[PDB]
């Protein structure tokens, strides 16, 4: 291969990668949506950038090897909690270390790969019972 697939298969288990493919494949191919689902089951976090890259190379349906290349793009070794915290800190106008659930929802649903309102609120409610969200703790949590 050309992609860093050996390093992927040291982080994730090849058996799981293969089993999840077989769960979702049709005619020996997997849709991008199901590839992204599998990536998430494996603990990876694809964005729209990752999906669009692979779609532009190979279309909406991936062969096994193309799916492996997609998974390699999803690894994101450079993910860094401080960069995520600083993103939310930008909106912390009063410098309290908290953002309300509504504030967090607005951020998450307005820019980037926008979540739906229900997705955002469900994620926030899963993390905290209270309205003030410690966004440092939230970022530390979501990376795990």
């Amino acid at each position: 291969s050309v992609a860093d697939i050996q390093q992927l298969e040291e982080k994730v288990d090849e058996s799981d990668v293969r089993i999840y493919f077989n769960e979702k494949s049709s005619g020996g191919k997997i849709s991008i949506d199901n590839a992204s689902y599998n990536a998430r089951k494996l603990g990876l976090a694809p964005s729209s950038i990752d999906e669009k890259k692979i779609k532009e190379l190979y279309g909406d349906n991936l062969t096994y090897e193309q799916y492996l290349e997609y998974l390699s793009i999803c690894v994101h070794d450079k993910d860094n909690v401080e960069e995520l915290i600083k993103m939310f800190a930008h909106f912390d106008n009063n410098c309290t270390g908290y953002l309300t659930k509504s504030q967090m929802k607005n951020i998450l649903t307005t820019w980037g790969d926008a979540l739906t309102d229900q997705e955002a609120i469900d994620a926030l409610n899963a993390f905290s019972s209270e309205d003030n969200i410690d966004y440092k703790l939230f970022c530390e949590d979501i990376l795990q």
Binding site: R40, G43, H76, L115, A123
Partner: peptide, 15 residues
């Protein structure tokens, strides 16, 4: 960054 946050949230949604 924001897209990374959203990506990890969607990951968490699955497991």
């Amino acid at each position: 960054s924001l897209m990374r946050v959203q990506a990890h949230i969607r990951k968490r949604m699955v497991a």
